[PDB]
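Q: Hi! First time asking for a complex rather than a single chain. Here are the components, and I think there are three in total. Is that enough to go on?
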Amino acid sequence: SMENFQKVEKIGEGTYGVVYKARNKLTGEVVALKKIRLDTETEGVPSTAIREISLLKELNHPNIVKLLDVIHTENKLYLVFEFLHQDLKKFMDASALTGIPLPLIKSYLFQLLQGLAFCHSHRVLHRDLKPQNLLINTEGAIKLADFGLARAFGVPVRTYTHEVVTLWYRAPEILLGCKYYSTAVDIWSLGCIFAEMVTRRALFPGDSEIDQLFRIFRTLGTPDEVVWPGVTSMPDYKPSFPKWARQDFSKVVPPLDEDGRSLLSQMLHYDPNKRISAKAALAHPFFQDVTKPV
Amino acid sequence: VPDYHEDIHTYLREMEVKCKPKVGYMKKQPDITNSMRAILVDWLVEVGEEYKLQNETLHLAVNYIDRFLSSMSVLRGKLQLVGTAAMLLASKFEEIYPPEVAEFVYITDDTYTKKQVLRMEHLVLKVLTFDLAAPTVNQFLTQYFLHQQPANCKVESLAMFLGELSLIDADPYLKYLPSVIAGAAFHLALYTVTGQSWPESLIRKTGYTLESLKPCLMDLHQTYLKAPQHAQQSIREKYKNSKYHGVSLLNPPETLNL
Amino acid sequence: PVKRRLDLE
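A: Yes, that's all I need. Here is the structure of the assembled complex.
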């Protein structure tokens, strides 16, 4: 099992486990080992691990972190993933001065949409895109990771869980209690991330649900039926919501040029139906000149 | 969400072949038959209604049992154990709120311990190598449903019901793929309720015609006509509920005139 | 009843 794996150092602690960086001693491959603890007379294999392993086994794509193997014992579950030296948050906290060069932002976003488009084509919603789950290696690649909260969706979808997506990256339609959400919530998250990679600060760092909404509202305008047929009918919409006017996008993320603005703008659309899709976003002129910088 | 509608349909077509169970299987199981299986799937139906699970969970669990039994001989005394760990795997996979393992030990009437259900859970995962995202009949029906004009809720429930009926009989339903049973089910329902037939757009979409759906459809039609007489009745009962527009009370056509 | 061990013999 773990015969071939020498553990190097501790690398992250998770929901039901520890993750180490280890070295396969016969291929030499460096990997990430996510130890998942079990025990019987419990609840068995955690639903999150059941989803993560099975969804990940369907997703093979260069911008999706790779599950290499799963090692089972009478007691422990060991998930072996390809190793990636950093995550995006930690890379933004070190571009603190510099800031991230546009060319790298472009590569990254373009890579992320590749990965996300692949997930959506394989009927998988990620549901927690945030910089902590975006891994980058030393070659210029960035990869979606952490599919603990992921789920296989149907067409059309039905009501799926609500406790969903780390608040700051959470979409309007979930904030508003919709009974149906989809693939578009991942796009919202990615749009929040494109902003952050640019300003280096979160775009909507709220502390409660309603707090998150109003932040959203004050930045993009309070939604009405013209902009979003159905908002006023959503379970958590309230006619008492203050009615803020929409800002220019040029003020929302000042350093963006027109193409950047138009894209972020289509990722941050109120109405899930008009919000762009990862696939379509791949073709945006924002990307005409992209390259995979290191 | 027609950005990915076709891509997924395609991917599911490919996956349904990889998750197909073996057609013979039951002939290789010395101590079990197609009748005990029927007994087992009927029971998962009531467990699904007892615990209020999605029909999806029900389709997945049966897919897990069939694949599990394509490669592991099991004694009649453990068939329910397998069935139970399957139901639990499907729930954890598919349900917002899966029932608790103890609740799974509880509907067996303490036939198995928590320990055995957990150990079974783990062996099923090993044997399936965690390939749990399997295409089901439910998932094909749902897509086909976007092709209605206009939508017809009686049509929807009745297709679901015929599709659920097919889970009960390995002979012959194991020999057909989920997408095919779904086409036969969608057509029978449409035709039974409204007299309409399998639509052109589903031809463009799936490459299937009544001609290609014919066999399964001839089987599915006898299954539907014979349903009141079947040793298993949990699906019919189940479908007398208004949650399902009481469609199991409708009358099947005596002929399908093809 | 659901609560039941299935009998097959």
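A: Chain C is about 0% helix and 0% strand. Let me know if you'd like any chain examined more closely.
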